[PDB]
Ligand binder design. Structure first.
Ligand code: HEM
Ligand SMILES: COc1cc(C=O)ccc1O
Length: 403
């Protein structure tokens, strides 16, 4: 509807999935808050606007249309008030820093070693499928109580939920343009139910130290549990983003380091720099790139746009993390970038609950990788492609090393 942005009418969903950075560079300059027709929503592209919307008292949580179609209610990312307070209290115990420090090393390090031992003497590997994704899902899967669900299956589930959650394209009338793209999300949920319903049956009668068992029991009156239908949407939140994003983050960090071979050498030589390398990695390609949204609760003015009450705004944190008002040459990976705040974990009341855990998973995984393969190099015979608008990461990461 905005005349000078008529070019946005020609932006396609495929373009945003393959490479959103050119469109979003224009948005950050022309319209930090803009309606994108193919997404059917206002989008916030700059750090100032994302931060304001995510922390404003005049906005509250909502799920995107395709996200809500995929997860239903009450997904922790999309609720407010008393329900959100309860779901936050439910997930937070195992994520508390002092608790994570008690067991994170004994959890992740043996998992990383197990997967590394399968290929560390081959001289070649595709690290997304052989290392980054397995370590991410096996670590969280064991924490949750899903020890008997294979990492192949956890990876398949987050991939299907990813595509369903981000099936956001809409047509002229604002209707989903690809309604059949939700079917594999529905099929993944059906499989998850078949596996998890018996585990919940068991945990209700025999609680244990698994996180989902504690979700059922913690804070409840004696003999009561949270109803499974009340917690399943937050289980899906985990089985998508919590399973996927640490693997995305460590892979993007590696791609970034490979693009700066001098900096990769530094980090291999001095592993205490791995946390700094990961933080730049998350800024450089944010795993949660534009998955979330807020909705206005009152009429509000943002970036010169007068929004009525009830207006959704998508939070494109991955674009915000390339805001040239903050960073110099943000499209380049730079380990020695001055440490600044970033928005890869969001902001406000709905900011990431698992930051401390996620950073440790990524750190320990990179530590063990660089120890087992110090002469790791990227297979330049292959190129690295990134995919995703809602969630973004490399689709593969071929490497080689002298055995
Ligand atoms: C590098 C890995 C990760 C990244 C980049 C990431 C990023 C984010 C982002 C951007 C949000 C939305 C924040 C907002 O809307 O302002 C979020 C929400 C959330 N994340 Fe993380 N995440 C990561 C890993 C994890 C892990 C491993 C867990 C659990 C163990 C987790 C648990 C959560 C939860 C529960 C929420 C919802 C918070 C709420 O709505 O109140 N995250 N995360
Ligand atoms: C932490 O996992 C999730 C986070 C988000 C944030 O927008 C969306 C879907 C997810 O599964």
């Amino acid at each position: 509807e905005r005349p000078d942005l008529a070019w946005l009418d020609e932006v396609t969903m495929t373009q945003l999935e393959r490479n959103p950075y050119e469109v979003y560079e224009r948005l950050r300059a022309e319209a930090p808050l803009a309606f994108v027709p193919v997404l059917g929503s206002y989008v916030a592209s700059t750090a100032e606007v994302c931060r304001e919307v995510a922390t404003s008292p005049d906005f509250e949580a909502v799920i995107t249309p395709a996200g809500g179609r995929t997860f239903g209610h009450p997904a922790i990312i999309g609720v407010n008030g008393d329900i959100h307070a309860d779901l936050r209290s439910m997930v937070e115990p195992a994520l508390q820093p002092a608790e994570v420090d008690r067991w994170i090393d004994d959890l992740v390090r043996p998992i990383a070693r197990r997967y590394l031992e399968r290929f560390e003497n081959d001289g070649h590997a595709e690290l997304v499928a052989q290392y980054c994704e397995p370590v991410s899902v096996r670590s969280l899967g064991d924490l949750l109580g899903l020890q008997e669900v294979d990492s192949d299956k956890l990876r398949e589930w987050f991939a299907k939920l990813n595509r369903s959650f981000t099936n956001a394209a809409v047509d002229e009338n604002g209707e989903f343009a690809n309604p059949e793209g939700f079917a594999e999300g529905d099929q993944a949920k059906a499989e998850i139910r078949a596996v998890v319903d018996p585990l919940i049956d068991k945990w209700i009668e025999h609680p244990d130290d698994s996180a989902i068992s504690h979700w059922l029991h913690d804070g409840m009156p004696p003999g009561q549990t949270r109803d499974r239908e009340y917690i399943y949407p937050t289980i899906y939140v985990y089985l998508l983003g919590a399973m996927q994003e640490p693997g995305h983050g460590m892979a993007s960090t590696l791609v970034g380091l490979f693009s700066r071979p001098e900096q990769l050498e530094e980090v291999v030589d001095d592993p205490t720099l791995i946390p700094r390398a990961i933080a730049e990695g998350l800024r450089w390609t944010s795993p949660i790139w534009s998955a979330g949204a807020r909705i206005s609760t009152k009429p509000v003015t943002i970036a010169g746009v007068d929004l009525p009450a009830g207006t959704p705004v998508m939070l494109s944190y991955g674009s915000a993390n390339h805001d040239t008002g903050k960073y110099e040459a943000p499209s380049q990976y730079d380990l020695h970038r001055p440490p600044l705040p970033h928005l890869a974990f969001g902001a406000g009341n709905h900011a990431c609950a698992g930051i401390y855990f996620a950073n440790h998973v990524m750190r320990i995984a990179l530590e063990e990788l660089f120890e087992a393969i110090p002469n790791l190099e990227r297979d330049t015979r292959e190129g690295v492609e990134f995919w995703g608008w809602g969630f973004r990461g490399p689709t593969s990461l071929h490497v080689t090393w002298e055995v």
